[PDB]
């Protein structure tokens, strides 16, 4: 499957941390370069809350890709669809609901 | 990192590095170890 349809409730963490090449000269001077050619990828600390019956579907969707493989997702941050991969997706079970915590990493591929 | 287990790893990595350096010195310029 290609698209992620579930929704993220609480307020995620969107980390950029671009990679740069930095050289530190002597008395206060330096030299900086963007290191790479195509921007930075940016990662989302996402958390879902789902009914106990729908947690199986979410697990199947997250396990089919299995760490590798990318799926489409429109983050509720910039509203631009991107390709992401998930690699951990911890999940905590409760009496009537299941809370998923995951880290979605944007990928060019 | 617990010291007792890390010391063996450091020693064995040192052994590997010493062997690699010895084999490198047996080349043309080198030092012939």
């Amino acid at each position: 499957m290609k698209t992620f349809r579930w929704k993220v409730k609480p307020g995620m963490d969107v980390a950029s941390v671009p990679s740069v090449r930095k050289v530190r000269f002597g008395d206060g001077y330096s030299q900086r370069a963007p290191a790479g050619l195509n921007a930075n990828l940016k990662t989302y600390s996402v958390t879902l809350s789902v009914p106990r019956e729908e947690a199986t579907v979410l697990e199947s969707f997250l396990e089919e890709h299995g760490g590798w493989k990318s799926f489409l997702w429109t983050p509720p941050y910039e509203w631009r669809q991107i390709k992401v991969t998930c690699a951990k997706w911890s999940s905590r079970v409760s009496m009537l609901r299941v809370e998923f915590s995951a880290e979605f990493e944007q990928v060019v591929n | 990192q617990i010291g007792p287990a890390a010391l063996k790893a450091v020693y064995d990595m040192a052994r590997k590095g010493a062997r690699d350096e010895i084999q490198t010195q047996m080349r043309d310029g080198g030092l012939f170890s």
Binding site: S19, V20, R21, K22, A35 | -
Partner: protein, 56 residues
Amino acid sequence: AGSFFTAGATLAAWGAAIGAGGMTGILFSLGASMVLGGVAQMLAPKARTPRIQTTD
């Protein structure tokens, strides 16, 4: 030669970040290592001589 000046710079900010993929540590300046045989060895390869034979 003794951890007298490893703590001179205290290595704190680098050690707390173990290094980076952009930059490498343990550079190990080759100053005194390249000069062990002599300055004339850094410029010329020190032509060799045959082993002295007792037959001669």
